[PDB]
Amino acid sequence: NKAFHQLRQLFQQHTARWQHELPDLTKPQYAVMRAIADKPGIEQVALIEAAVSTKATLAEMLARMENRGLVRREHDAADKRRRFVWLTAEGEKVLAAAIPIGDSVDEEFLGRLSAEEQELFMQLVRKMMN
């Protein structure tokens, strides 16, 4: 009966489908790779907002991604705290295969709305944000 409760229901159903179709790439991981491909060499701090995570969660996720050869990083010579992120060629393949999968999972729920309903749903979400 609460709005944010039903939002948790919808988000859990989406996560459940995402788990089945993309078992090795969660939605936060997918958003990070997508934001790196949208801006190769993006600075790690700007990647926090671009992928909707946190400084600590992004650092742990990027470390695991380069452990698996999916991303590579370079450092600011004047400030080693500043890092820039690229996808490797293997990371570009992992992302390219996952995009039509993730799109179909998003479509299972969004496709239940008309174009006007989709545009309106995004206007309301934008209105509630800070």
Residues that bind a second copy (CB under 8 A): 2-14, 27, 31, 52, 106, 109-110, 112-113, 117-118, 120-122, 124-130
CB of 25 to a second copy, least distance (A): 15
Q: What Cα–Cα distance (Å) separates residue 118 from each residue in 18, 50, 84?
A: 20, 22, 35
The Cβ of residue 76 has, within 10 Å, a number of other Cβ atoms equal to 11
Min dist CB 107 to a second copy, Å, is 10
State which residue, 20 or 112, has the beta carbon closest to a second copy.
112
Cβ at position 55, least distance to a second copy in Å: 13
Q: Can you state the percent helix, strand and coil of the chain, rounding each to 5?
A: 70, 15, 20
Smallest distance from the beta carbon of 73 to a second copy, in angstroms? 23
Strands 42-43 and 71-76, by their bridges, are unpaired
Residue placing its CB nearer to a second copy in the complex, 56 or 77: 56
